[PDB]
């Protein structure tokens, strides 16, 4: 466990993280994809080597000895909100088994369902709140990665609050 588990918010290319394993917002299907999936594909390839799991489910594959845990979240524009809402809680649950399960003391996630998977609608909070659901119990250091100014105030805002 990390000594003082924390959550910490970053603008940046969650390639590029500084932690010990990585959260795709990933496809059913394990293809390269768009968004965080076509720069996690880019980064580390190898970890799409039999990554296709179900929507609600996370999968990990080894890139080397470094940790990629392939998460789905619905596709809101498929889903409805009652169902999308339950298979994008249950993304999060997995990912906290997988992090527990791994040992890790950091992990690097994106907000699940909020790009081309939100329906077009604004899931900051949903989403926010189902990754707090799943990690609260965990003593990982979680570092939420966005590319947004606005999004970083806001998830930056709802950590501080609960301090
Ligand atoms: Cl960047
Ligand atoms: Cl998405
Ligand atoms: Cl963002």
């Given at each position: 466990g990390a000594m003082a588990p924390s959550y910490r918010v970053k603008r940046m290319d969650?390639?590029?993280?500084?932690?010990?394993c990585v959260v795709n917002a990933a496809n059913?299907?394990?293809?390269?994809?768009?968004?965080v999936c076509k720069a996690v594909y880019k980064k580390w390839?190898?970890?799409?080597?039999?990554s296709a799991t179900p929507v609600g489910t996370a999968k990990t594959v080894m890139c080397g000895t470094y940790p990629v845990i392939h998460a789905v979240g619905p596709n809101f524009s498929n889903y409805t909100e009652s169902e999308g809402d339950r298979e994008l809680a249950a993304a999060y649950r997995e990912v906290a088994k997988e992090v527990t399960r791994l040992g890790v003391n950091s992990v690097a996630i994106p907000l699940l369902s909020?790009?081309?998977?939100?329906?077009?609608?604004?899931?900051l909070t949903q989403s926010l709140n189902h990754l707090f659901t799943a990690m609260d119990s965990t003593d990982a250091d979680v570092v939420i990665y966005c590319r947004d100014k606005e999004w970083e105030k806001k998830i930056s805002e709802a950590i501080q609050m609960r301090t």
């Open positions: 969650i390639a590029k993280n500084d932690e010990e059913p299907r394990g293809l390269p994809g768009d968004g390839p190898e970890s799409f080597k039999n909020t790009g081309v998977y939100s329906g077009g609608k604004d899931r």
